[PDB]
Design an enzyme around this catalytic site. Structure first.
Site, PDB file in Angstrom:
ATOM      1  N   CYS B 106      -3.264   0.021  -4.983  1.00  0.00           N
ATOM      2  CA  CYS B 106      -4.857   0.816  -4.768  1.00  0.00           C
ATOM      3  C   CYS B 106      -5.779   0.252  -4.217  1.00  0.00           C
ATOM      4  O   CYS B 106      -6.119  -1.013  -4.152  1.00  0.00           O
ATOM      5  CB  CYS B 106      -5.261   1.069  -6.260  1.00  0.00           C
ATOM      6  SG  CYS B 106      -6.938   2.075  -5.990  1.00  0.00           S
ATOM      7  N   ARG B 109      -9.838  -0.327  -5.437  1.00  0.00           N
ATOM      8  CA  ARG B 109     -10.332  -1.046  -6.667  1.00  0.00           C
ATOM      9  C   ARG B 109     -11.809  -1.672  -6.924  1.00  0.00           C
ATOM     10  O   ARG B 109     -11.880  -2.015  -7.921  1.00  0.00           O
ATOM     11  CB  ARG B 109      -9.242  -2.024  -7.103  1.00  0.00           C
ATOM     12  CG  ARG B 109      -7.859  -1.221  -7.593  1.00  0.00           C
ATOM     13  CD  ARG B 109      -6.947  -2.351  -7.820  1.00  0.00           C
ATOM     14  NE  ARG B 109      -6.105  -2.752  -6.688  1.00  0.00           N
ATOM     15  CZ  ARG B 109      -5.260  -3.801  -6.583  1.00  0.00           C
ATOM     16  NH1 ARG B 109      -5.109  -4.542  -7.797  1.00  0.00           N
ATOM     17  NH2 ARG B 109      -4.751  -4.332  -5.566  1.00  0.00           N
ATOM     18  N   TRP B 278     -11.562   9.380  -4.671  1.00  0.00           N
ATOM     19  CA  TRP B 278     -11.724  10.463  -3.619  1.00  0.00           C
ATOM     20  C   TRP B 278     -10.647   9.718  -2.396  1.00  0.00           C
ATOM     21  O   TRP B 278     -10.118   8.666  -2.352  1.00  0.00           O
ATOM     22  CB  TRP B 278     -13.361  10.005  -3.064  1.00  0.00           C
ATOM     23  CG  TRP B 278     -13.790   8.596  -2.804  1.00  0.00           C
ATOM     24  CD1 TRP B 278     -13.672   8.158  -1.908  1.00  0.00           C
ATOM     25  CD2 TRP B 278     -14.674   7.957  -3.774  1.00  0.00           C
ATOM     26  NE1 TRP B 278     -14.262   7.009  -1.920  1.00  0.00           N
ATOM     27  CE2 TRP B 278     -14.760   6.855  -3.265  1.00  0.00           C
ATOM     28  CE3 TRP B 278     -15.423   8.549  -4.993  1.00  0.00           C
ATOM     29  CZ2 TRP B 278     -15.776   5.841  -3.857  1.00  0.00           C
ATOM     30  CZ3 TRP B 278     -16.115   7.313  -5.667  1.00  0.00           C
ATOM     31  CH2 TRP B 278     -16.251   6.277  -4.982  1.00  0.00           C
ATOM     32  N   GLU B 283      -4.706   8.873   4.394  1.00  0.00           N
ATOM     33  CA  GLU B 283      -4.017   9.737   3.639  1.00  0.00           C
ATOM     34  C   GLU B 283      -3.618  10.866   4.040  1.00  0.00           C
ATOM     35  O   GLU B 283      -2.541  11.421   4.229  1.00  0.00           O
ATOM     36  CB  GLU B 283      -4.405   9.736   2.301  1.00  0.00           C
ATOM     37  CG  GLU B 283      -4.508   8.217   1.363  1.00  0.00           C
ATOM     38  CD  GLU B 283      -4.939   8.422   0.162  1.00  0.00           C
ATOM     39  OE1 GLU B 283      -4.387   8.876  -0.841  1.00  0.00           O
ATOM     40  OE2 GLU B 283      -6.407   8.364  -0.047  1.00  0.00           O
TER      41      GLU B 283
HETATM   42  C1  HEM Z   1     -12.273   5.727  -5.741  1.00  0.00           C
HETATM   43  C2  HEM Z   1     -11.585   6.597  -4.616  1.00  0.00           C
HETATM   44  C3  HEM Z   1     -10.236   5.740  -4.681  1.00  0.00           C
HETATM   45  C4  HEM Z   1      -9.837   5.434  -3.158  1.00  0.00           C
HETATM   46  C5  HEM Z   1     -10.489   5.655  -1.868  1.00  0.00           C
HETATM   47  C6  HEM Z   1      -8.582   5.012  -3.709  1.00  0.00           C
HETATM   48  C7  HEM Z   1      -7.425   4.553  -2.638  1.00  0.00           C
HETATM   49  C8  HEM Z   1      -6.220   4.787  -2.640  1.00  0.00           C
HETATM   50  C9  HEM Z   1      -5.106   4.884  -1.639  1.00  0.00           C
HETATM   51  C10 HEM Z   1      -5.359   4.787  -0.203  1.00  0.00           C
HETATM   52  C11 HEM Z   1      -3.837   4.459  -2.429  1.00  0.00           C
HETATM   53  C12 HEM Z   1      -2.368   4.897  -1.619  1.00  0.00           C
HETATM   54  C13 HEM Z   1      -1.967   6.242  -1.502  1.00  0.00           C
HETATM   55  C14 HEM Z   1      -0.900   6.659  -1.005  1.00  0.00           C
HETATM   56  O1  HEM Z   1      -0.272   5.840  -0.118  1.00  0.00           O
HETATM   57  O2  HEM Z   1      -0.629   7.868  -1.183  1.00  0.00           O
HETATM   58  C15 HEM Z   1      -4.048   4.526  -3.755  1.00  0.00           C
HETATM   59  C16 HEM Z   1      -2.957   4.494  -4.610  1.00  0.00           C
HETATM   60  C17 HEM Z   1      -3.281   4.144  -5.920  1.00  0.00           C
HETATM   61  N1  HEM Z   1      -4.406   4.353  -6.410  1.00  0.00           N
HETATM   62 FE1  HEM Z   1      -6.352   4.368  -5.785  1.00  0.00          FE
HETATM   63  N2  HEM Z   1      -7.947   4.989  -4.929  1.00  0.00           N
HETATM   64  C18 HEM Z   1      -9.056   5.302  -5.321  1.00  0.00           C
HETATM   65  C19 HEM Z   1      -9.431   5.634  -7.026  1.00  0.00           C
HETATM   66  C20 HEM Z   1      -8.368   5.555  -8.083  1.00  0.00           C
HETATM   67  C21 HEM Z   1      -8.529   5.790  -9.271  1.00  0.00           C
HETATM   68  C22 HEM Z   1      -9.874   6.405 -10.116  1.00  0.00           C
HETATM   69  C23 HEM Z   1      -7.334   5.290  -9.965  1.00  0.00           C
HETATM   70  C24 HEM Z   1      -6.985   5.012 -11.150  1.00  0.00           C
HETATM   71  C25 HEM Z   1      -7.811   5.547 -12.406  1.00  0.00           C
HETATM   72  C26 HEM Z   1      -6.416   4.837  -8.667  1.00  0.00           C
HETATM   73  C27 HEM Z   1      -5.076   4.221  -9.060  1.00  0.00           C
HETATM   74  C28 HEM Z   1      -4.384   4.278  -7.927  1.00  0.00           C
HETATM   75  C29 HEM Z   1      -2.681   3.823  -8.413  1.00  0.00           C
HETATM   76  C30 HEM Z   1      -2.055   4.021  -9.669  1.00  0.00           C
HETATM   77  C31 HEM Z   1      -1.963   4.154  -7.070  1.00  0.00           C
HETATM   78  C32 HEM Z   1      -0.519   4.271  -6.771  1.00  0.00           C
HETATM   79  C33 HEM Z   1      -0.136   5.593  -6.698  1.00  0.00           C
HETATM   80  C34 HEM Z   1       1.350   5.605  -6.559  1.00  0.00           C
HETATM   81  O3  HEM Z   1       2.178   4.661  -6.681  1.00  0.00           O
HETATM   82  O4  HEM Z   1       1.992   6.992  -6.580  1.00  0.00           O
HETATM   83  N3  HEM Z   1      -7.019   4.983  -7.465  1.00  0.00           N
HETATM   84  N4  HEM Z   1      -5.537   4.892  -3.956  1.00  0.00           N
HETATM   85  C1  LIG Z   2       8.136   8.796  -8.623  1.00  0.00           C
HETATM   86  C2  LIG Z   2       6.584   8.512  -7.771  1.00  0.00           C
HETATM   87  C3  LIG Z   2       5.452   8.858  -8.493  1.00  0.00           C
HETATM   88  C4  LIG Z   2       4.012   8.593  -7.827  1.00  0.00           C
HETATM   89  N1  LIG Z   2       3.032   8.965  -8.432  1.00  0.00           N
HETATM   90  N2  LIG Z   2       4.227   8.074  -6.718  1.00  0.00           N
HETATM   91  C5  LIG Z   2       5.234   7.589  -5.948  1.00  0.00           C
HETATM   92  C6  LIG Z   2       5.070   7.019  -4.302  1.00  0.00           C
HETATM   93  C7  LIG Z   2       5.069   8.286  -3.434  1.00  0.00           C
HETATM   94  C8  LIG Z   2       4.784   7.799  -2.079  1.00  0.00           C
HETATM   95  N3  LIG Z   2       4.312   8.905  -1.505  1.00  0.00           N
HETATM   96  C9  LIG Z   2       4.124  10.190  -2.282  1.00  0.00           C
HETATM   97  C10 LIG Z   2       4.125   9.462  -3.745  1.00  0.00           C
HETATM   98  O1  LIG Z   2       2.627   8.791  -3.880  1.00  0.00           O
HETATM   99  C11 LIG Z   2       1.888   9.868  -4.033  1.00  0.00           C
HETATM  100  C12 LIG Z   2       0.658   8.950  -4.224  1.00  0.00           C
HETATM  101  C13 LIG Z   2      -0.871   9.638  -4.001  1.00  0.00           C
HETATM  102  C14 LIG Z   2      -2.029   8.813  -4.303  1.00  0.00           C
HETATM  103  C15 LIG Z   2      -3.144   9.615  -4.245  1.00  0.00           C
HETATM  104  C16 LIG Z   2      -4.411   9.112  -4.623  1.00  0.00           C
HETATM  105  C17 LIG Z   2      -4.895   8.846  -6.078  1.00  0.00           C
HETATM  106  C18 LIG Z   2      -6.261   8.303  -5.989  1.00  0.00           C
HETATM  107  C19 LIG Z   2      -6.928   7.924  -5.104  1.00  0.00           C
HETATM  108  C20 LIG Z   2      -6.685   8.333  -3.750  1.00  0.00           C
HETATM  109  N4  LIG Z   2      -7.200   8.210  -2.646  1.00  0.00           N
HETATM  110  N5  LIG Z   2      -5.377   8.585  -3.811  1.00  0.00           N
HETATM  111  C21 LIG Z   2       6.627   7.898  -6.696  1.00  0.00           C
END
Ligand code: HEM
Ligand SMILES: Cc1cc(N)nc(C[C@@H]2CNC[C@@H]2OCCCCCc2cccc(N)n2)c1
Ligand code: HEM
Ligand SMILES: Cc1cc(N)nc(C[C@@H]2CNC[C@@H]2OCCCCCc2cccc(N)n2)c1
Ligand SMILES: C[C@H](O)[C@H](O)[C@H]1CNc2nc(N)[nH]c(=O)c2N1
Ligand SMILES: C[C@H](O)[C@H](O)[C@H]1CNc2nc(N)[nH]c(=O)c2N1
Ligand SMILES: [Zn+2]
Lengths: 404, 402
Positions: B106, B109, B278, B283
């Site tokens: 993320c 953070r 947000w 993205e």
């Molecule tokens: C405040 C606004 C936020 C921004 C701009 C932000 C930004 C991002 C970005 C750019 C990614 C990579 C997404 C992708 O490549 O698809 C990401 C992934 C992640 N974010 Fe943040 N984020 C924010 C809020 C949060 C919040 C509130 C949480 C949890 C409470 C969070 C937890 C995560 C997690 C767990 C991932 C990995 C998701 C995955 O592996 O699929 N994010 N975020």
């Molecule tokens: C199995 C699996 C579950 C999971 N949640 N994510 C993955 C990784 C793949 C890599 N591309 C699609 C998927 O990730 C989706 C993550 C979207 C993140 C959305 C998000 C959340 C909070 C803030 C923000 N700016 N954007 C794989």
């Protein structure tokens, strides 16, 4: 699936298993507890086993594994080590080991070309002056008036007690970096240390942004000696933009030949401390890193100002826009100059082909994702979506301490 | 040994000592680095529980207090008797913030302390889940002034099926597979689209049809719920200077809300705990619209721009991608919907690394995910070394429920 790393491509949904990683002898920086993959910086009986392993690799590559000649070479190598403590490579063994070191290099996106390498054998070299002659010949052959050809020149291996052959410069072509009174740098800040070493050894410094450095060449147990490259030997490309007429007024340029001169080539336990190699550039190395890194020429703002962009706010994407135009100018200028160059799209498409070739040939390809993915437009290239397994195989190019 | 971590732009070095607190393994070994990969009894529970309770009282500076000792006895007593335990609301709130803090992928953070936590652990039907989800969406959206939030449904229990949201995000556009191989809409959502239709949804035939939610209460068939159209804020895409861009008919939703991840706090597992913040403009602009296996609009935009499509070295792809990202930022700003560009986001992440270095002695980060998909080396994070490792509380992936 098997118990080998599973490797996925997220664009195409296809999967492979890397079985080559089993051939790794050298440990990398990672453990189960933490991934240190993004870090830039990661013999008695030991020689014999490295040598045997390399000799087995050579005989496999010529499909004579287990042959009489295979077993005779092993015995030769061990007798030679037995009596002298070291051994020597046959010519064809050197050519094979050099190509294999390239083939094995996890950070190189150009490896589709690996089989096509001119190997100059310079293991007869015995002075700094002769090193310079060999280097000049390398540069002439490799440059080839703009039709670039991959090449490496190999100088004598490390020997017990005796000092090393070393090229002090990190590349055969480098621009001077002059530390100013105000603490800023004129020229390339990457090259400040090597510039001041050159002056300490008697070079008369210039004061331009693009002054080519002399070479500091070191033969065994001697102070390094200084050699100026004849200017007509160093091909350069003045940079212009296809539609932005003012870009040529910036006086930007880059040299044609990327030639790494500070790496150690390791083959079967033997260590070639001076073994400079060269290819041709991928355009992002010049237009994105060398020209736009904040700690390099740092030209992004200047170009944005000329393009009349809003540089006061990140959300205009002024950096992205300027960087695209700089990369286009690099590509355009090299094409006009008839000097070989490859764009990051073409290079990465060709690296995907390489990965497929190696999957069939060896069952894997060691690759460093952070280095392979280009520094602009990353996910627009097919490699971004390709998982990669990084590990060290030998023969290898390795970093080595600076000689001073 | 503790990892030396260097920034190559500034020449500065830190040492990561927080990594010593990692208890779960990553995919890597001394033999081979697997960091680019996208996917990977009671005494065990008791250790995770105690350690987490320790984290909590330490965070309120009451480490060793009466309250601390007594809470540890409660947890011990409850595990010893029932094989499990339950979190106090304030502990839950702490663990949810920490899970986000700990998330290596993320880039957002810097915001980790600012998270609205909705306790939905008194949920007993898919119907109630839908009510809680609507309240989340409404709170988090806030008419475009987005606020980070998480809603936490009831934990996994040994004796029964999980509470699950089948959808990967709360807002997803349908992907309709055509007989002739191609997809209409979002190819990422083909599987969930088909599951919805199969559970009785009347499908649309547009490129941007918002999917219903499939919500599952334990050991029950999932249920279908159409989100009320007024709850889903969307931004039509236009370009500040290219007039024809609006004509592409492009749009994206405001709210990124992940709904398929497991939240793990003190050994307990929350199989449904959707969270939202947000968007960072890349993205949408880069991945969702330009990935070749997503909406894949690069070529269309390039033709509209009259670019030379015939050769890669014209950098048509790079030029089109920039304008598309610019249009996303412009359109979100114009609609007054919270968004952050990749330069501002990475700058803030660098500040976060520095905060965490002083606070904790390090920060787990996944370089491949932190560096934006365009203009990598133009952002400061490209030049920063990063150590990736798993700390608990954690968000994790989990199997799909079907
Ligand atoms: C405040 C606004 C936020 C921004 C701009 C932000 C930004 C991002 C970005 C750019 C990614 C990579 C997404 C992708 O490549 O698809 C990401 C992934 C992640 N974010 Fe943040 N984020 C924010 C809020 C949060 C919040 C509130 C949480 C949890 C409470 C969070 C937890 C995560 C997690 C767990 C991932 C990995 C998701 C995955 O592996 O699929 N994010 N975020
Ligand atoms: C199995 C699996 C579950 C999971 N949640 N994510 C993955 C990784 C793949 C890599 N591309 C699609 C998927 O990730 C989706 C993550 C979207 C993140 C959305 C998000 C959340 C909070 C803030 C923000 N700016 N954007 C794989
Ligand atoms: C044929 C044209 C070639 C292209 C387009 C090419 C491309 C590249 C690129 C883009 C990098 C990363 C550079 C950076 O980020 O600074 C690289 C690194 C590397 N390349 Fe290749 N390369 C080519 C030929 C060669 C040859 C002939 C060798 C050796 C025989 C080689 C071995 C390496 C090694 C060892 C590195 C890592 C250097 C380091 O870590 O400092 N390359 N190359
Ligand atoms: C100690 C050390 C030695 C060494 N050779 N490389 C490093 C890594 C740093 C990271 N950035 C500068 C330095 O690497 C420079 C690599 C230049 C590669 C240029 C090249 C060679 C061959 C073909 C081509 N297209 N391009 C560190
Ligand atoms: C910290 C990080 O590993 C470092 O900036 C790397 C990232 N990727 C790179 N990739 C290439 N090709 N060359 C580099 O010098 C770097 N630098
Ligand atoms: C194979 C590779 O790890 C994969 O394409 C990753 C790279 N970096 C990423 N970074 C982010 N933020 N999101 C992603 O989905 C990905 N995909
Ligand atoms: Zn690793």
């Amino acid at each position: 699936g098997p118990k080998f790393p599973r490797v996925k491509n997220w664009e195409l949904g296809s999967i492979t298993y890397d079985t080559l990683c089993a051939q790794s002898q050298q440990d990398g920086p990672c453990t189960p507890r933490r991934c240190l993959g993004s870090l830039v910086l990661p013999p008695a009986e030991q020689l014999l086993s490295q040598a045997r392993d390399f000799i087995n690799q050579y005989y496999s590559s010529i499909k004579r594994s287990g042959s009489q000649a295979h077993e005779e070479r092993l015995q030769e190598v061990e007798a030679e080590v037995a009596s002298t403590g070291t051994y020597h490579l046959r010519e064809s063994e050197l050519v094979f080991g050099a190509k294999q070191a390239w083939r094995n290099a996890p950070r190189c996106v150009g490896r589709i070309q690996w089989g096509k390498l001119q190997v100059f054998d310079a293991r007869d070299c015995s002075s700094a002056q002769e090193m310079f002659t060999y280097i000049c010949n390398h540069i002439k052959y490799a440059t080839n008036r703009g039709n670039l050809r991959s090449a490496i020149t190999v100088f004598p291996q490390r020997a017990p007690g005796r000092g090393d052959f070393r090229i002090w410069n990190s590349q055969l072509v480098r621009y001077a970096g002059y530390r100013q009174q105000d603490g800023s740098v004129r020229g390339d800040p990457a090259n400040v240390e090597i510039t001041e070493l050159c002056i300490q050894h008697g070079w008369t410094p210039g004061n331009g942004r693009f002054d080519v450095l002399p070479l500091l060449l070191q033969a065994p147990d001697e102070a390094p000696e200084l050699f100026v490259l004849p200017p007509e030997l160093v091909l350069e490309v003045p940079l212009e933009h296809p539609t932005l007429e003012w870009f040529a007024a910036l006086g930007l340029r880059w040299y044609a030949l990327p030639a790494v001169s500070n790496m150690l080539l390791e083959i079967g336990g033997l260590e070639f401390s001076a073994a400079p190699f060269s290819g041709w550039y991928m355009s992002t190395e010049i237009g994105t890193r060398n020209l736009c890194d904040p700690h390099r020429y740092n030209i992004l703002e200047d170009v944005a100002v000329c393009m009349d962009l809003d540089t006061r706010t990140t959300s205009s994407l002024w950096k992205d826009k300027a960087a695209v135009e700089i990369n286009l100018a690099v590509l355009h200028s090299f094409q006009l100059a008839k000097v070989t160059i490859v764009d990051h799209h073409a290079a990465t498409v060709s690296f995907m082909k390489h990965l497929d070739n190696e999957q069939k040939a060896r069952g894997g390809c060691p690759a460093d994702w952070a280095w392979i993915v280009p520094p602009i437009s990353g996910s627009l290239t097919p490699v971004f979506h390709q998982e990669m397994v990084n590990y060290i195989l030998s023969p290898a190019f390795r970093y080595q301490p600076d000689p001073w």
